[PDB]
Amino acid sequence: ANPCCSNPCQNRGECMSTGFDQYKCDCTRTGFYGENCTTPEFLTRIKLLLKPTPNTVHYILTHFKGVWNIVNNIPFLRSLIMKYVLTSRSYLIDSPPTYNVHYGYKSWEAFSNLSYYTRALPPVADDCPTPMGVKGNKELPDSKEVLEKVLLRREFIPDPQGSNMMFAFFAQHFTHQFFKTDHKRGPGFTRGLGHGVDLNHIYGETLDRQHKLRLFKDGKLKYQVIGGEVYPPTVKDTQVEMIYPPHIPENLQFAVGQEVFGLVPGLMMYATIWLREHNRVCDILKQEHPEWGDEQLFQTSRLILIGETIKIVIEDYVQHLSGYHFKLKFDPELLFNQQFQYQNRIASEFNTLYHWHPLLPDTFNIEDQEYSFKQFLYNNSILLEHGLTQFVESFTRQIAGRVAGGRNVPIAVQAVAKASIDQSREMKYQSLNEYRKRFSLKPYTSFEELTGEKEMAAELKALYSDIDVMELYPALLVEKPRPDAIFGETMVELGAPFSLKGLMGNPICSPQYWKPSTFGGEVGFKIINTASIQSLICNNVKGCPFTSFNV
Amino acid sequence: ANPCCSNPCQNRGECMSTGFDQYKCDCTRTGFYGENCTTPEFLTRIKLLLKPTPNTVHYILTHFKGVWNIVNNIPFLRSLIMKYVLTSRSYLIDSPPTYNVHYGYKSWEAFSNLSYYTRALPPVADDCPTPMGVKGNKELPDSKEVLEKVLLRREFIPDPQGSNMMFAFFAQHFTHQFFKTDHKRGPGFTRGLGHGVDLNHIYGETLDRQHKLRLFKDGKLKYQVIGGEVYPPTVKDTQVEMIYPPHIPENLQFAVGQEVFGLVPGLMMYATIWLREHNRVCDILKQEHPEWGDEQLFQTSRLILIGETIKIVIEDYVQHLSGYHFKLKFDPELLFNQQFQYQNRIASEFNTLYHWHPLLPDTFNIEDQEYSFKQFLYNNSILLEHGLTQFVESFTRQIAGRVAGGRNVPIAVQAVAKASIDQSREMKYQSLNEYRKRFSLKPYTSFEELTGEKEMAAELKALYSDIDVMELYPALLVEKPRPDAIFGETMVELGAPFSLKGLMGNPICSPQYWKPSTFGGEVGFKIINTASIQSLICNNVKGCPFTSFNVQ
Ligand SMILES: COc1ccc2c(c1)c(CC(=O)NCCCCNC(=O)CCC(=O)O[C@@H]1c3cc4c(cc3[C@H](c3cc(OC)c(OC)c(OC)c3)[C@@H]3C(=O)OC[C@H]31)OCO4)c(C)n2C(=O)c1ccc(Cl)cc1
Ligand SMILES: COc1ccc2c(c1)c(CC(=O)NCCCCNC(=O)CCC(=O)O[C@@H]1c3cc4c(cc3[C@H](c3cc(OC)c(OC)c(OC)c3)[C@@H]3C(=O)OC[C@H]31)OCO4)c(C)n2C(=O)c1ccc(Cl)cc1
Ligand code: HEM
Ligand code: HEM
Ligand SMILES: *[C@@H]1O[C@H](CO)[C@@H](O[C@@H]2O[C@H](CO)[C@@H](O)[C@H](O)[C@H]2NC(C)=O)[C@H](O)[C@H]1NC(C)=O
Ligand SMILES: *[C@@H]1O[C@H](CO)[C@@H](O[C@@H]2O[C@H](CO)[C@@H](O)[C@H](O)[C@H]2NC(C)=O)[C@H](O)[C@H]1NC(C)=O
Ligand SMILES: CCCCCCCCO[C@@H]1O[C@H](CO)[C@@H](O)[C@H](O)[C@H]1O
């Protein structure tokens, strides 16, 4: 019914109805003109002719190790390439943000209401004849069938990049500060009103919760000691609400910033590590500033840990994921002579993309034990039983599952994968190929090209019929991986822009914040600029065990 | 006690305690170095030698009319010069914002908590020996004495720039969408969480209030018709909360986005005009888009009115205030190749600077009546009696008061002026001269230099003793005006950067928003780009009466 239902405008042109059966494309600043913005301007053709494909660039970044080592030791050159990585696809994220689940056109409501996830592509209008707009059948294929035929794990498929459980739980822990879906409102809504890396998963989303978690001495967070080891405090002691089954003993109801982090001992592990890190930084700052009060010690520590988090995410986490030989760098100064918006709004599609449950193993292997999902979930006695040191040693060695390549979602979380499919549809996501085009990728022309195989392709073809009707979320998990990589092209090219924007968009990266006095002087500053996943663990885990994001 | 109490760091260097009795200045990117960041780098000295004073630039913009007329007709240069005006304050504003009334150091709390006004200068710490830090006496002069001696009006002083009551109430109406102090929390808190030109004063701050105000047909706002004329609906009919004294008739409790706009008929006049404008834009969009629903018509109209507001504020309102011969221009495209943050946080100091009550006359003259404050306040029957047309005609003719130059606050609002002084102190504002340095102005070296005269200066010296202890708010109202101007240097140089930032920082000015389809196509876009105070009145007020921000 809506004449824009077919998504006729190309190259990020905007579709507007101009009557009941007519549309106009707004081609402003697309670099294209014509009825659906498909005729390139002269400068546009030039850019197209020279532009290498993502797969080409990825080849270059994952080969020529000798050249990159040279590059990695020339600071001017390293900065130049990193600046490039940051800016080079800046243009892909709308900032200030635009659409959301209820608005397929720009509006003050969509801009101003922070309870929404934002949208990289507007929803398919309600009165469109098909789920994807006009293509495909009246109904999408049964989600349970899509799940079982191409998503569910048969045999465990290990990640060829060697991601471990330290990585898997870091990813879960880190992302769950800004992926916090407000289920009473709906899948397109979030409880993370900071829309980014504010460390609310440690400090709490609201002031009241934060104040319940704080010691109000020396800037510190409340904690308890169990068997000589520092752990988070209890629900009983703090009165902060946590989600626990009713049979969890009170001494085991740990209280942390994020209410769901008692779900898994792997999350509780990182919650404990970061809590220890906060109180460590408090000690350092108190030493530097005996004249400071509790409030300033707390606030400054929080800013430093925000810095540490961004530092580690870029130079260890993203570094490992990328498989690049180039050494990524956290350096806000790189953007100071660039056009860049220091703000971020979390996209629903980013949330969708990041459902990396194929990472999960069949069992969680700690010391000599192999825990089932049933044994692991909501069981912090496991963390207490083995301790942090053994957790780190064990998880550093246990390999995680491959995310792309198909059929690697453990059946234990099959309902989660199904919900990702069903909620994608509920939120009226456009198709895989629409999203590929939105991020300057070539549409897939068959299911075999998507998977790079034959059997899953075929089951998919029977289910969806048209490649242009293939859905975003299942496509990510069945996509042909990059060579010996964890992800395919679509995951990387859509996810990377959201990721860097969410990291660099933080106010501590802005010129007025990025200076030593913000962090209590050069000592605080150095904590950020020398942070690593290894030093995080070394400083806060007894025995300073070796760790890494790969086995 | 705090070693930073004396504000030792200069040139926007940041002070940090490094112990109980020592400090360090962080001179990063200030262009200066040394212990208090006062030694300039080579590039800095050059920059300092060449850059003209504000008063010099003001002279240039308010003279050579023949030359400016040439420039005004050369788009490249008009654009170039406008781009310049925009990007020349752009650094003086911290964006993302930093301090607030409770935080004199940067913190996640100060950044993230939108209930605060932000601060251009951090508060004086609580444990400082004097209100201004270390200078001056233990307590500041009695605010009642400052008020009575140099602020209160003796004889009405007209604005030499000819500002009229259309201007004065436009200023009040426009600013009260982002100056909305949350008195339950304290003076450093705001209820305007949009922190800018979101037109909540028309549409309501919250979704619940907006929906009570909406007709939910054709995108329109609810209204009533009285004697053939369109007015806001009532509280009785909408359940929209408004502030009225209990003796106001039900049929006279008009309900609009901003709960305080029943305060004066002048606010209700503009509330009514903008209400009519919204529904007018709804008719236009419905004509262009018969296929659209109520929701999209409403949202699209709101975006258009936001655009119109920014347009009018720059090209009519700021144009008038400036007295420039150069013709200012609303054009977002000017910033597309510039470094610029499309965001804004309303500063407490901006609020303070905008307390322009000397604008108010002794009486409000409509048609052949002259209403006292007592008769004018909370009296919407006056608007009904005379009608919008007569309001516009009368307010266009009545001159407003000079704001700087001293002794021009009407006695009727003396408590408001005193509260501005007292709440500034409550919020631990730094001194006039600290704020002057913060905006790259030379500190005043005496009270006579501040006022440009002798009598008020002598009274201020008796009260404050030290010029470095003079307060920001009273200084603004007693400052030597620019020649035949409404304001002095401090008002302009502090206010202009906040103002432009608040206007251009709006998301509709960003490249992904600033395109025709955002506003329903070329017709909607054209409404924004051709808006003016005269067209706003001509389209919505019977008879298309002439209006202007200056007396004719
Ligand atoms: C693969 O393994 C992983 C996995 C995850 C990764 C990562 C890697 C990574 C790493 C990562 O993201 N690396 C980025 C690799 C760099 C990609 N570079 C390219 O594709 C080449 C693009 C290029 O150089 O040209 C651009 C460009 C391209 C354009 C374009 C404009 C521009 C644009 C441009 C603008 C111009 O001015 C108008 C130009 O003319 C002057 C111009 O030509 C010179 C180009 C860019 C520019 O100014 O500098 C680079 C240019 O319109 C049409 O296409 C992250 C961050 N990741 C994540 O954080 C992440 C996290 C979670 C998830 Cl789920 C996914 C990813
Ligand atoms: C007259 O009455 C009123 C009243 C109200 C007004 C207004 C007027 C106005 C109008 C308004 O905003 N007027 C502003 C006056 C004009 C401002 N222009 C200037 O100050 C020119 C400054 C200039 O040209 O020099 C800068 C400059 C200066 C520097 C500096 C760097 C630069 C910087 C610069 C950079 C350079 O390298 C690129 C330079 O070398 C090439 C360079 O030259 C050496 C200068 C700027 C630049 O690149 O272009 C202009 C340059 O380091 C320290 O000093 C508004 C908006 N108003 C309001 O909206 C308003 C509303 C409410 C309130 Cl309360 C107050 C105001
Ligand atoms: C370790 C055991 C894990 C379990 C038991 C688990 C289970 C769940 C469940 C039940 C949900 C809620 C689904 C819904 O409400 O519809 C969820 C959401 C999610 N999961 Fe996991 N998951 C695990 C690990 C991971 C990992 C390693 C990642 C990696 C990033 C991840 C990423 C996500 C994301 C991004 C969401 C959306 C969160 C939100 O929007 O609030 N999960 N998971
Ligand atoms: C026309 C009659 C006017 C009356 C009766 C009036 C009265 C008041 C009152 C009672 C306050 C509240 C003070 C407090 O709560 O401490 C106030 C604040 C204020 N006034 Fe006026 N005023 C008038 C006109 C104006 C005008 C023409 C301007 C021009 C800009 C203006 C600017 C302001 C501002 C910016 C505030 C602060 C508002 C806030 O922080 O919420 N007022 N006025
Ligand atoms: C952001 O938008 C959501 C979506 O409409 C708002 O939530 C609704 O609020 C209205 C009125 O307050 C209720 O009648 C609805 O039941 C709510 N719906 C949902 C799905 O929650 C929300 O209030 C908006 N947030 C703000 C701050 O305005
Ligand atoms: C923004 O800051 C204000 C001031 O700290 C917060 O208001 C306080 O909230 C606490 C606990 O919620 C109350 O005990 C105080 O009485 C409140 N003080 C004032 C002055 O209102 C407010 O909650 C903060 N907002 C957010 C979203 O964190
Ligand atoms: C662990 C989940 C088993 C899936 C059972 C439901 C039917 C799934 O379906 C089939 O599964 C076979 C098993 O590998 C594959 O050969 C087929 O291609 C697939 O279609």
Ligand SMILES: *[C@@H]1O[C@H](CO)[C@@H](O)[C@H](O)[C@H]1NC(C)=O
């Ligand atoms: C795109 O424009 C072409 C004309 O160049 C037209 O034939 C076509 O119908 C348009 N859109 C679609 C979805 O086909």
Ligand SMILES: *[C@@H]1O[C@H](CO)[C@@H](O)[C@H](O)[C@H]1NC(C)=O
């Ligand atoms: C919880 O973990 C302990 C190991 O500490 C294990 O023995 C126990 O069986 C687990 N509980 C459940 C219900 O699986």
Ligand SMILES: *[C@@H]1O[C@H](CO)[C@@H](O)[C@H](O)[C@H]1NC(C)=O
């Ligand atoms: C600023 O530093 C100078 C040394 O350059 C010192 O004499 C002075 O005490 C400092 N501050 C003030 C306010 O005098």
Ligand SMILES: *[C@@H]1O[C@H](CO)[C@@H](O)[C@H](O)[C@H]1NC(C)=O
């Ligand atoms: C309100 O205005 C009317 C004129 O319409 C006037 O007659 C009346 O006295 C005013 N009310 C008060 C309380 O002054």
